[PDB]
Amino acid sequence: GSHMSWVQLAGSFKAAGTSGLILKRCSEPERYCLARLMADALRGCVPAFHGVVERDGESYLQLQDLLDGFDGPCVLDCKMGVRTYLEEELTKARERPKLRKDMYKKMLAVDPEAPTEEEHAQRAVTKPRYMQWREGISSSTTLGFRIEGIKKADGSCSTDFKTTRSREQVLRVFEEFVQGDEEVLRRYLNRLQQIRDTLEVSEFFRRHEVIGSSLLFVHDHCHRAGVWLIDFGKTTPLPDGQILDHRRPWEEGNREDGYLLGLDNLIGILASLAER
Numbered sequence: 722g723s724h725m726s727w728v729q730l731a732g733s734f735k736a737a738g739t740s741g742l743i744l745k746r747c748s749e750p751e752r753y754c755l756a757r758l759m760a761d762a763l764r765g766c767v768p769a770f771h772g773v774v775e776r777d778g779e780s781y782l783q784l785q786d787l788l789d790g791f792d793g794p795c796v797l798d799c800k801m802g803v804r805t806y807l808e809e810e811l812t813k814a815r816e817r818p819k820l821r822k823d824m825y826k827k828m829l830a831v832d833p834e835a836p837t838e839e840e841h842a843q844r845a846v847t848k849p850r851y852m853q854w855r856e857g858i859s860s861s862t863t864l865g866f867r868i869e870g871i872k873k874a875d876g877s878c879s880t881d882f883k884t885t886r887s888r889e890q891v892l893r894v895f896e897e898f899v900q901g902d903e904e905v906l907r908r909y910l911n912r913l914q915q916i917r918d919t920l921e922v923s924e925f926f927r928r929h930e931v932i933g934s935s936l937l938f939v940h941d942h943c944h945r946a947g948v949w950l951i952d953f954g955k956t957t958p959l960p961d962g963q964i965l966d967h968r969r970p971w972e973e974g975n976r977e978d979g980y981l982l983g984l985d986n987l988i989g990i991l992a993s994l995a996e997r
């Protein structure tokens with residue numbers, strides 16, 4: 722039905738006036754991206770963007786609610802890329818680090834030996850360091866994506882995936898998510914194949930570094946299934962008509978995100994699951 726229904730039953734999102742719409746807090750990178758995307762090959766692969774509206778003296782993107790077509794939708798959010806932070810974050814952590822004490826606590830929680838003697842003494846870490854560690858204990862570094870969360874229309878949710886890393890561990894999460902619905906799985910794979918084809922010819926995609934974006938998988942008990950790209954908050958245009966291949970390894974300076982390495986691996990896992 723609607724994402725705000727799930728928010729209620731379960732805060733960067735707000736109920737929209739119009740049926741089948743949702744409001745997301747406006748950010749300049751994301752607004753720029755969605756405007757370009759409505760004119761791009763990737764138009765059909767992203768939520769419809771209708772413009773910006775003011776609500777309580779605040780800027781919101783008016784988006785298609787992707788859950789609107791579904792009867793009690795199941796949702797899985799997959800963070801795409803081998804890298805999950807911008808290169809400019811490495812620069813700022815070198816010249817002027819913002820010691821994040823929150824990121825220290827989670828890291829200790831998951832691995833006590835993970836922080837350095839100095840990080841322990843600071844009780845704090847830089848964002849890039851926290852983000853790189855998260856990439857290595859999840860599937861991000863090796864497969865180029867990670868499962869972030871599953872939501873169900875009752876209000877039910879799990880984000881308990883920070884150590885889901887192996888190909889088989891990831892397959893077992895998708896196995897449990899689709900619950901033996903062969904039609905949903907087939908529809909997911911058909912949609913991902915058609916998304917890969919669109920990305921490989923997209924003018925937007927070859928000209929932009931896509932960091933921190935997700936693939937949202939949505940299905941219901943009527944076997945309806947959809948996948949969309951979301952979250953263009955960290956998607957930045959390359960300078961002077963430079964382009965990325967989105968498969969080759971990331972080395973500081975080359976701005977590569979491994980986005981299609983992730984999608985290739987994600988398609989392979991779903992095709993493997995379909996043959997079980």
Ligand SMILES: Nc1ncnc2c1ncn2[C@@H]1O[C@H](COP(=O)(O)OP(=O)(O)OP(=O)(O)O)[C@@H](O)[C@H]1O
Binds near residue numbers: 733784
């Ligand atoms: N257009 C949409 N329609 C329906 N649900 C959506 C839509 N966009 C986002 N969502 C829901 O909101 C969640 C968060 O989306 P998104 O990543 O864009 O926001 P964010 O505030 O940047 O979050 P994060 O910091 O986790 O990346 C999605 O995983 C999904 O459950």
Ligand SMILES: O=P(O)(O)O[C@@H]1[C@H](O)[C@@H](O)[C@@H](OP(=O)(O)O)[C@H](OP(=O)(O)O)[C@H]1O
Binds near residue numbers: 805806855933954955
């Ligand atoms: O999921 P987590 O392990 O909790 O980490 C969070 C997650 O990677 C994203 O939500 C990041 O936002 P993004 O950099 O805009 O994508 C958060 O970044 P901050 O807003 O905290 O700086 C980070 O905290």
Ligand SMILES: [Mn+2]
Binds near residue numbers: 933952954
């Ligand atoms: Mn985000």
